[PDB]
Design a binder for this molecule. Structure first.
Ligand SMILES: *[C@@H](CCCCCCC)CC(=O)O
Length: 218
């Protein structure tokens, strides 16, 4: 099915870089540098990092979705509307050459599957809500544990995902996150009733992403 096989143009090992806390702009610059290196024939890369607290807005963000307290926002070129990154949220930036003709939806679906599996491996039952990319726990309201916002340029991916581990969720209350006003944002820690850190899930996230891209998630 759609998840089988590989989305990649080259079957070489992904270079996984476990970074620390990296300013949003600095990381964005590195993403672009790595993407150019990939087009020049270099490796596929997966950056895993945390950002200092920041709101970011893709082009589709609407004015009323911005912080109700006037907090500044970084405009960014990924898909999606507004989100927040900060301590305790694991941000992943897969910088991957995709096979052409492109299937960006399938790429997003593979990132979702990777994070669904990470949740499953912790004993949680997460999945998709069609039309609302990312990873959700069912409920009324439904609870979003991971966000996705990507862009593909020159058949190479940019941006990625963000998995809420033990971050303070209060930042999400000041915005309309990803254009959604009828739901909620959660974290692994809130769902499991214990602190689940970024560092505890770094390795399993890396493994899951790399497996999903090549169709070999368990
Ligand atoms: C809202 C934005 C989520 C961006 C996540 C970026 C992770 C690096 C998505 C939407 O509007 O659908």
């Amino acid at each position: 099915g759609a998840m089988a096989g590989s989305i990649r143009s080259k079957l070489s090992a992904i270079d996984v870089r476990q970074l620390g806390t990296v300013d949003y702009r600095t990381a964005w610059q590195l993403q672009r540098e790595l993407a150019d290196a990939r087009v020049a024939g270099g490796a596929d890369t997966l950056l895993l990092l945390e950002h200092p607290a920041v709101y970011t807005a893709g082009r589709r963000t609407e004015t009323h979705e911005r912080p109700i307290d006037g907090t500044p926002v970084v405009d960014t070129d990924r898909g999606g509307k507004i989100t927040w990154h900060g301590p305790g949220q694991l941000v992943g930036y897969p910088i991957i050459g995709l096979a052409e003709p492109l299937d960006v939806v399938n790429y997003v679906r593979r990132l979702e599957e990777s994070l669904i599996q990470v949740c499953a491996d912790l004993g949680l039952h997460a999945g998709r809500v069609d039309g609302r990319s990312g990873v959700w726990l069912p409920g009324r309201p439904a609870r979003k544990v991971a966000a996705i916002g990507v862009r593909v340029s020159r058949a190479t991916t940019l941006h990625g995902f963000a998995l809420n581990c033990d971050c303070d969720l209060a930042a999400f209350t000041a915005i309309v996150p990803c254009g959604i006003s009828d739901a909620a944002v959660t974290s692994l820690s809130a769902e499991l009733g214990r602190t689940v850190t970024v560092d505890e899930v770094r390795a399993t996230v890396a493994a899951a992403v790399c497996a999903a891209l090549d169709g070999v998630l368990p």
